[PDB]
Design an enzyme around this catalytic site. Structure first.
Site, PDB file in Angstrom:
ATOM      1  N   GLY A 191       0.736  -1.251   0.000  1.00 42.60           N
ATOM      2  CA  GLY A 191       0.000   0.000   0.000  1.00 42.60           C
ATOM      3  C   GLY A 191       0.769   1.307   0.000  1.00 42.60           C
ATOM      4  O   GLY A 191       1.514   1.657  -0.948  1.00 42.60           O
ATOM      5  N   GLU A 206      -3.701   3.295   3.680  1.00 40.29           N
ATOM      6  CA  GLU A 206      -3.853   4.680   4.100  1.00 40.29           C
ATOM      7  C   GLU A 206      -5.015   5.469   3.476  1.00 40.29           C
ATOM      8  O   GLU A 206      -4.831   6.117   2.449  1.00 40.29           O
ATOM      9  CB  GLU A 206      -2.535   5.415   3.853  1.00 40.29           C
TER      10      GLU A 206
END
Ligand SMILES: C=NC1=N[C@@H]2[C@@H](O)[C@H](O[C@@H]3O[C@H](CO)[C@@H](O[C@@H]4O[C@H](COC)[C@@H](O)[C@@H](O)[C@H]4NC(C)=O)[C@H](O)[C@H]3NC(C)=O)[C@@H](CO)[C@@H]2O1
Length: 365
Positions: free
Chosen positions: A76, A119
């Site tokens: 990510g 996030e």
């Protein structure tokens, strides 16, 4: 204690003495080396650079020289988005498919675990429904991990996650007391409290606040972030104090008001090697001839300035202060972003290789 260090796979594209590749890594420096970043392709774990699989081999090959070292691959990051995550955790099928690729993927490339860097769920376009689906994703990874451990006979894959400081972000999508139970450790990102996205200078990673602060602005510091994680259920031994080997820069509206809170007309001049305004690697700060360094007594971190440039960064001292603080706090250790942003080769700062992280290793160990 744990010293968790992140490697980034884009640092290899930096020019000159800043180019960073696995060979630049010290096997004995940290306890855990995390590889950033891996992406997704059809709900599966996947590489992001033409040479990730070769890099993987050098990365994990370091464990021969240091058999106690542990490695993880993080998926990510900030510039990853949320679609693919929100989507992969929507159906048991996708989760079940991701999980199985995770296990085949880590084992194939010799990673000891997976670090989740979503996030963030419950924000950035993530329906607060993802908050709870995140928790589920955690258990799934954990369970498959505990199971694969048995069948494969190898050591149980580790499970960590990069987490935000913000009360807002935490409440948006983090079931703390729960997920903390399934994470082997929690990488608290105690930085970016301040930056060029604001119209007044402030520090990237302040330990405490300045008297001049209260209310929400009061949380914009490490200690705030830490109490905020413990209070919600995180066992001190699993919380890892993340630290930055980079600082954030502003351009002063007037080179006369050079104090913490002064008017900034925008980002700080891009750094020569990092080439992105508002941020600078420590090794870009180091050098600075004919510049002025200060110390925010309240927040125990420094800053520098020259003409209309103002950058709040972390130094050897502030790192000693932070390791000192996490120790009193009884935290499981320190996390650092990122190995390639420190003067990793003693090429700018005249303090040897990895001045800041070497500091961490010393104080921690
Ligand atoms: C401890 N975990 C942790 N995760 C967060 C990281 O995402 C974040 O670091 C930031 O990650 C971005 C990628 O998700 C980086 O983007 C890259 O930026 C460079 C230029 O600056 C170096 C670009 O050239 C691209 O490579 C770009 N990549 C992508 C995919 O967009 C970003 O640089 C980096 N920021 C910093 C200061 O390192 C950290 C720290 O906030 C968090 O920690």
């Amino acid at each position: 204690a744990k010293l968790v260090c992140y490697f980034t796979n884009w640092a290899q594209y930096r020019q000159g003495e800043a180019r960073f590749l696995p060979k630049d890594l010290d096997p004995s420096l940290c306890t855990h080396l995390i590889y950033a970043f891996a992406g997704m392709t059809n709900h599966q774990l996947s590489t992001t650079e033409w040479n990730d699989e070769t890099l993987y081999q050098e990365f994990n090959g370091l464990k021969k020289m240091n058999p106690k070292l542990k490695t993880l691959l993080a998926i990510g990051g900030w510039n990853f988005g949320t679609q693919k995550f929100t989507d992969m955790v929507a159906t048991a099928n996708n989760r079940q498919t991701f999980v199985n690729s995770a296990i085949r993927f880590l084992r194939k490339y010799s990673f000891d675990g997976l670090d989740l860097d979503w996030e963030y769920p419950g924000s950035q376009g993530s329906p607060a429904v993802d908050k709870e689906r995140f928790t589920t994703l955690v258990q799934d990874l954990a369970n498959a991990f505990q199971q694969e451990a048995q069948t494969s006979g190898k050591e149980r894959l580790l499970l960590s996650a990069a987490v935000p400081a913000g009360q807002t972000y935490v409440d948006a999508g983090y079931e703390v007391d729960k997920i903390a139970q399934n994470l082997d450790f929690v990488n608290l990102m105690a930085y970016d409290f301040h930056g060029s996205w604001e119209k007044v200078t402030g520090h990237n990673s302040p330990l405490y606040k300045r008297q001049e602060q209260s209310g929400a602005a009061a949380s914009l510091n490490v200690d705030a972030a830490v109490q905020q994680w413990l209070q919600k259920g995180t066992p001190a031994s699993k919380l890892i104090l993340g630290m930055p080997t980079y600082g954030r820069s502003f351009t002063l509206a007037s080179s006369s008001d050079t104090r913490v809170g002064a008017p900034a007309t925008g980002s700080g001049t891009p750094g020569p090697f990092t080439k992105e305004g508002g941020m600078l690697a420590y090794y870009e700060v180091c050098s600075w001839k004919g510049a002025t360094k200060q110390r925010i007594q309240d927040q125990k971190v420094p800053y520098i300035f020259r003409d209309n440039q103002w950058v709040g960064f972390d130094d050897v001292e502030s790192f000693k202060t932070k390791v000192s603080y996490l120790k009193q706090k009884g935290l499981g250790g320190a996390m650092v972003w990122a190995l390639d942003l420190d003067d990793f080769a003693g090429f700018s700062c005249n303090q040897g290789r990895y001045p800041l992280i070497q500091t961490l290793r010393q104080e921690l160990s």
